[PDB]
Amino acid sequence: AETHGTRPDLTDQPIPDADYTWYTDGSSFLQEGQRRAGAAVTTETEVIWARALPAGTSAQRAELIALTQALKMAEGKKLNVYTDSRYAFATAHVHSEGREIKNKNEILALLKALFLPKRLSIIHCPGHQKGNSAEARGNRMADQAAREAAMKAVLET
């Protein structure tokens, strides 16, 4: 049981009985002078969802959006979901009392979506990993799909 959290039964380690294990990533980069971004939810081997996000979108906000989308798609199911983002992890895990100065909308939407899955763990794993370990391949896969989605939309196809 977490405390000063939002969803009281949310955990940070893999639940034995999970139906789904997904990896999420936001990615942001500058191209043609402007900030571009995308978000994705994947397993080790398959892209469940990935989208380009509007110009200006920070990495932080892209990461909230990716994690929020995974929670929605897992509604009613038991989910282990990994993020490489300490900021999305904290936002999910720790309740903040101050009126949000940044990403107020994305944070509000992530917080509502926390309650969708039947059971949930949001786990933070390291990014940029070279392993064939499940997590390594999961996180790589999510990073690649999110960057790819953002790239394809900026280039226009």
UniProtKB/Swiss-Prot annotation:
Source domain of life: Viruses
Position of the signal peptide: none
Covered residues, full protein: 1157 to 1324 of 1733
Name the UniProt record assigns to this protein: Reverse transcriptase/ribonuclease H p80
Annotated Mg(2+) 2 binding sites: 25, 143
Primary gene name: gag-pol
Catalytic activity entry: DNA(n) + a 2'-deoxyribonucleoside 5'-triphosphate = DNA(n+1) + diphosphate
Domain RNase H type-1: 16-151
Cofactor(s) listed: Mg(2+); Mn(2+)
Positions that bind Mg(2+) 3: 25, 63, 84
Annotated DNA binding sites: 31, 58, 60
